[PDB]
Structures are given as structure tokens and as C-alpha cells.
Design a protein around this ligand. Sequence first.
Ligand SMILES: COCCO[C@@H](C)CO[C@@H](C)CO[C@H](C)CO[C@H](C)CO[C@@H](C)CO[C@@H](C)CO[C@H](C)CO[C@H](C)COC[C@@H](C)N
Lengths: 213, 229
Amino acid sequence: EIVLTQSPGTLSLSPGERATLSCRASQTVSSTSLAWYQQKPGQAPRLLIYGASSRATGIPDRFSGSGSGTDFTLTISRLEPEDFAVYYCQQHDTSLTFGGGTKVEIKRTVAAPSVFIFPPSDEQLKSGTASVVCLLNNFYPREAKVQWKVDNALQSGNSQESVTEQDSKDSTYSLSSTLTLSKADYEKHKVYACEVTHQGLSSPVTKSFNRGE
Amino acid sequence: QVQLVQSGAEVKKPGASVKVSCKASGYPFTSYGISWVRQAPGQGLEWMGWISTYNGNTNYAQKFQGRVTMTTDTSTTTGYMELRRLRSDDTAVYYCARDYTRGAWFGESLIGGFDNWGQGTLVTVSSASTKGPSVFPLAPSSKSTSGGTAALGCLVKDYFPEPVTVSWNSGALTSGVHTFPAVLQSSGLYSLSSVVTVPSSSLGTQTYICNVNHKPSNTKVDKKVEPKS
Ligand SMILES: COCCO[C@@H](C)CO[C@@H](C)CO[C@H](C)CO[C@H](C)CO[C@@H](C)CO[C@@H](C)CO[C@H](C)CO[C@H](C)COC[C@@H](C)N
């Protein structure tokens, strides 16, 4: 098979700049059999470029493809707000293979997260389960670090986090890490804290609460 | 003219099968092939196979050979895709598209791609059964106060399957609300949280309540989030 590798996995550019998306192939791919696709969030993919360089019907002139052999490049001359999506390259020279995809992210000024922590409700404690939630609200870039510390002991393998999509208004991200423990294990300790490390923070922020207070 | 309407969402047990339909219209149906692509939640596109609407020849991907069977009904201009022996990692959105990469008559290589796509079919494979969500309040306090802003939310925990809709004050509080994508717990049940930032001055006077709706279990929960002491 012919493996298509797209780099980078995420491209962070501000609206208005020119975007260049690469699609390297493991073998020489015929120029007439390489296609580019766009997938907006929550929609089906849409054919952008066909035959490496020819654009499909209804595609703006800012989209253009180039390259031959193993190196191919999709170019967006001016990034529009609707142009921020994921782009896949596809070849059918030998069988058929899609690329890894390249998410074009809106590049924003660095924004520090507003860290909040929520103790497990007594309604949930009555069911023999305690869930502690650490909230990271509105931050850029997406990369962050959340560590759960229970009585200074680092927690690992017992928490799940979730990140929202890039906000359509301020182009920011939000994270929600949920530490799940049994009611018995929850009542064995006192201090519950999540340490948040981000680029917008000069030092990692720690929001804590003592159980029973 | 060209439209591709797919069948509704499916929820199947591991080991079972699922058949997805692809109703085509607006173009000579037997002149174009039909390709099928699936997309796991969060992952990229994955080609499944190609079928000629003329002779019926199929070219499946090696990953799905033996489990997938694509058929077309020329009398109804409908393409089908059956995937048997479903496993948990088969949970994905299955798309169908009008193919212009291989000739439907002679199998020649074409200068084109997948022009028109379908709306997609979400197939969820899990051994879990339908269960209503337990809504717990994320009560605010001084720990959830960054300046004058306070944060409070709801914990939609332990439910199956997707989705759930969360609104605040019957949908009147939308600005500053973040409903996070659900995480799949080890128990097979989903769980998410929906938070909202509000001024700390309004914690004592205002009333905040989340409206959690889960249609598969017919569960409607209105949990009031109050600041605890
Ligand atoms: C809007 O939807 C239209 C769907 O097509 C309808 C007309 C219904 O057609 C379906 C039933 C097609 O079912 C079988 C694939 C049709 O097979 C019959 C035997 C072929 O039809 C004959 C009457 C003519 O078919 C031409 C019109 C299309 O066939 C293409 C050209 C294949 O060409 C063969 C392989 C070689 O042609 C010889 C060439 C040198 N003249």
C-alpha cells in the first residue's frame, strides 16, 4: 500500500495568512490520482482538489494544489474563517489511501486558563462514588497539563479529561478533568488538588479543597 | 441534482452486523461507482471499499476483507454496505460517496475523486445497554472564584448511548457555557460535564439549573445547582 503522511497534524495560523499543507507519500504517486478533501466540523468531507492541481466545482480560487511524485502541497492563499477545518489528501494510484489529516487551527494570543475545582456532591457520595472535577476555562494554546494530587500523592490512571473544540468566538479551548474514586477511598484522604500547567501561567496554578470543609 | 441520503443511526452489540443504505438520485446511477469511507470519533478518514453500480464488482480494503459486503440495487438506485462481526472499534460514522476514481464499466483509473458525499451513518458498537444518566451538581464555592467570576456545572455521569443535550435555565443561559464531549468510561457508559461561568455576586440571588435530556432512555432531569454553604 501507499501510505500518505500529512505534517503537521495541527497547523496554527491566524485568519488571513497563507497556509501550506504537505502530503508526502511512501511511493511515487501519479499526479492524476491525488485528491484533497475538506471536512468542516460536524459535516461530511468535501472534494477540494482532484488530480493534484485541479480544483473541484464550487471551490474558491484561494484553494490550489501542486506537487508531483511523492511531495504534494495544498495551498490556501488567504485563510478565511470558514477555511479552518481538517484537510485530508487521498491517492488512488495503488488501491486507495487517505492521509492522516491536517487540522488548521486559529492562531490566537496566549491565554491563561481560569482553573476551577468542584468537590463531589453528596448526592453522588450516597451511591458509593466520588467524582472530583478540575475545570480549565478558556485558554490558548490547547496544550496543557493537569495533575491530580490527593494528600500530596500524585494520581495516575484514575482520571479522564475532555477538551472542547476551538471556541467560535474567542478561539480558545476548555478542559474538564474528572478524578473518579470510590466513597471509601475518597474518605481516606483530606486535601484534593489539581495542578494546572500552561504557557499563559508564569507558575502552575493549584486549586485545592479540604474534604469536609 | 445529485443527492446521497443514508440510513439512520445504528446501535449494535459486539459480534452482530449492520447494513447501511445509500440512496442515490440525480445522476445516471450505473455510470458512477460508489465508495464507502468510515471515520472513528476523533480519528481520520478510512477507506473501506469500492463497488461498481454496473457489473457489481467490488474492491474492498484489506482491513475489512471478510467482514464487509457491498451491494447495489439498480432498480432503487440504492447502495448498501454490510459489516459483519462488529467489534467495539468499529464504532464510527460510515459515509458513502459517488466515486470517480475507478470506472464503473471497465475499472479504469479516473482523474477525479469523491465528488458528492452522504450525510453519514453513525454506527455505535458496544456491549452496554440503554441506561439513564445520573445528574450530579458541581456546586460552586470560594474555590471556584477567579476574581468576580464563579463557575458551576452539572455532571452527566453513567449513561448510554450518545447523545445528551444540556441547557441552562431552559436555554436562557448560553453565553459562557461549556458542554464538554463525553468520555467513554471503562464500564462502557458515557459521562460528560457542562459548566458555565457566572458572576460571583449572583450566586446567592440568582437560580441556576441544568436541563439534561437523554432521549434513548427518555430521561429528563432538572438539577438545581446551588452554592454549598
Ligand atoms: C437514473 O438511473 C439510471 C440507472 O440505469 C437504468 C437505465 C437501469 O440500468 C440498470 C438496470 C443497469 O443494469 C445492468 C448493468 C444493465 O445491463 C444491460 C444488459 C446493458 O444495457 C444495454 C441495454 C445498454 O447499456 C449501455 C446503455 C450502458 O452500458 C455501458 C456502455 C457498458 O458498455 C458495455 C460493457 C460494452 O459496450 C459495447 C460498446 C463498444 N458499444
